[PDB]
From Swiss-Prot, chain B:
Name of the protein in question: HTH-type transcriptional regulator TtgR
Species name: Pseudomonas putida (strain DOT-T1E)
Primary role: Represses expression from the ttgABC operon promoter and its own expression. Binds to a promoter region between the divergently transcribed ttgR and ttgABC genes/operons; in the presence of chloramphenicol or tetracycline this binding no longer occurs and ttgR and ttgABC are derepressed. This suggests that TtgR binds these antibiotics.
Entry keywords, A to Z: DNA-binding, Repressor, Transcription, Transcription regulation
SUPFAM superfamilies documented for this protein: Homeodomain-like, Tetracyclin repressor-like, C-terminal domain
Domain of life of the native organism: Bacteria
Amino acid sequence: TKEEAQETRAQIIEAAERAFYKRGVARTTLADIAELAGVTRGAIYWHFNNKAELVQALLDSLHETHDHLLRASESEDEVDPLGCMRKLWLQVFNELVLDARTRRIMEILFHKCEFTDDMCEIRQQRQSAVLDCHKGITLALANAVRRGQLPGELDAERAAVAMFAYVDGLIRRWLLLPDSVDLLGDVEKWVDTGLDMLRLSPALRK
Amino acid sequence: RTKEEAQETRAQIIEAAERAFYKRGVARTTLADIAELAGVTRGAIYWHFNNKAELVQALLDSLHETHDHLLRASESEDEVDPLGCMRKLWLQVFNELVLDARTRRIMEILFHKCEFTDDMCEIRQQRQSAVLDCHKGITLALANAVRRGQLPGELDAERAAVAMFAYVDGLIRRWLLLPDSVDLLGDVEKWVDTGLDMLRLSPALRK
Ligand SMILES: O=C1CC[C@@]2(O)[C@@H]3Cc4ccc(O)c5c4[C@]2(CCN3CC2CC2)[C@@H]1O5
Ligand SMILES: O=C1CC[C@@]2(O)[C@@H]3Cc4ccc(O)c5c4[C@]2(CCN3CC2CC2)[C@@H]1O5
Ligand SMILES: O=C1CC[C@@]2(O)[C@@H]3Cc4ccc(O)c5c4[C@]2(CCN3CC2CC2)[C@@H]1O5
Ligand SMILES: O=C1CC[C@@]2(O)[C@@H]3Cc4ccc(O)c5c4[C@]2(CCN3CC2CC2)[C@@H]1O5
Ligand SMILES: [Mg+2]
Ligand SMILES: [Mg+2]
């Protein structure tokens, strides 16, 4: 049955989040996740080959809320690629602080997920996700340069690395020390600080 | 002598813990495993460390020594060029990461092979303490540079410290995950200056 299968996969993913958040990925097994989800008869193995597929599902689930702002910032036909990128990072930070699911998937991926040789797909799939995002940020920065919103001589690739590094570090800083960063109250200041680096730093120019 | 032999054995244990944590991760590695790798008895390893968290803290603490003279130079009110010492500090941070196998392996362990779990809550708390401490230091050096006129007078030192640390921390982990994406050694001056340019030119980082 169609709906029941998606029914069950969502139960498993939701239970996987609870299990990974409590006990970490390394020591959690699929059998333990099936126990939390209330699924039996090997159902979990029909939806996932291994834990890495479950981790990838959680990582893929983050790309959904922002799909439209990603598309807009990457499109050559977009009139305001820089403004759309600003709206994107504003949404990324807002969802992190406001959404329990997002914050806790990211906490799982960043602080409860080990890169090991017996589970090499986790690091490899993290490399691919970061690389994919870098391509998107680089392309959106190149659209802003062409629109006259960023320096004509900007090194879009290095500026994409710089922006990602800043956003990445800020998120992890808020996850580790929520009290230290009023990410929600000053979200615009935090987004503009990184954008300002791309706009003004002479080091980021070719 | 007792002291010399114990310090010798402690170093063997720490070195073997790096090899064990790096290969199998912190969560599934036991002190018994580390003892076998280090070639010491289980009683020996348990004399030096009560649990796995204490060993992780040992690695986490060793990172502070190499930079200890440059962070205190930028932190000193009497430093004539605090902004300059900060630049040399971050240059040295990135230089050691790329050149030093040990520092790279430890940071890879701490950032990518060590889970925050209720089963070992000391890990997260020690990371919280280390970041909070570094934040204070960075805030000191930024206020000195502002007072010395090297940074904007109306700069929010607290937020600027956060932003600089976020950039450096994010860059480190990007190079750890994708080394060929960041020539962190040949362009090290560019990568440091990019973040310093952020604190010095961003109108958002001002009150
Ligand atoms: O972080 C890292 C960095 C180093 C490694 O990347 C590489 C291969 C690999 C593959 C998958 C992993 O999860 C993982 C590794 C690591 C295990 C050891 N290797 C080194 C050998 C390819 C040369 C580890 O953890
Ligand atoms: O791999 C990835 C894929 C997607 C992301 O790259 C970006 C921003 C970001 C910044 C730092 C991370 O460690 C991290 C992310 C990710 C979290 C959220 N995303 C924003 C864009 C997907 C909308 C994640 O994990
Ligand atoms: O990131 C975090 C933030 C939240 C927690 O900090 C605290 C206690 C704790 C202790 C050690 C951890 O490794 C760890 C946690 C967390 C697990 C449970 N929480 C208790 C409070 C959320 C109710 C987690 O991961
Ligand atoms: O990546 C890094 C590189 C530099 C540090 O490693 C060391 C000590 C430390 C300990 C735990 C961290 O999470 C952390 C750090 C860092 C914070 C402070 N440092 C001292 C070195 C700046 C002189 C940071 O972030
Ligand atoms: Mg979402
Ligand atoms: Mg050192």
